């Protein structure tokens, strides 16, 4: 039975789980885009979001500083968190990271995933667009837009 347990089980125990997610999160803050196994990235996305939330409070706060000290291992990144990432998202109140699935890994055929922090300098991921607005179904729906707007 596992009803209502939101935390995956990975590594050699709870502690190794936190440490694995910590290394993933450090790599993400250092490079702003990493390809990792899908389940691990899905577990780490929440932590990266809340890390940006803690980083918005700013250097002066001590709780946020302790948290970013634990969750960043090469400390050169703590400046970045408080001076490049958190400032970058002064407008967005949520959803700072985008997560996609990518071709499975060559060796062990695992389910992969690229995760990145929105707005970085890197070449943009090939996001999937929706169908062009000029397609047949969209045109008929646009006609319905007009005809319903005039009636109402």
């Amino acid at each position: 039975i596992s009803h209502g347990r939101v935390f995956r089980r990975m590594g050699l125990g709870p502690e190794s789980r936190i440490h694995l997610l910590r290394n993933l999160l450090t790599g993400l803050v250092r490079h702003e885009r990493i390809e990792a196994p899908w389940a691990r990235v899905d577990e780490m996305r929440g932590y990266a979001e809340k890390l940006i939330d803690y980083g918005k409070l700013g250097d002066t706060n001590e709780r946020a500083m302790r948290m970013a000290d634990f969750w960043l291992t090469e400390k050169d990144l703590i400046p970045k968190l408080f001076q490049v990432l958190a400032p970058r998202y002064k407008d967005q109140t949520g959803g700072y990271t985008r997560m996609l699935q990518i071709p499975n890994r060559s060796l062990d055929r695992a389910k992969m995933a690229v995760i990145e922090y929105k707005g970085n300098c890197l070449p943009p991921l090939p996001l999937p667009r929706r169908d062009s607005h000029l397609t047949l179904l969209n045109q008929l729906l646009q006609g319905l837009r007009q005809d319903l707007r005039q009636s109402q």
Binding site: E74, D76, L77, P79, K80, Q83, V84, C121
Partner: peptide, 9 residues
């Protein structure tokens, strides 16, 4: 190593 800049790129 240990040279994460403090500005955008």
């Amino acid at each position: 190593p240990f040279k994460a800049p403090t500005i955008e790129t």
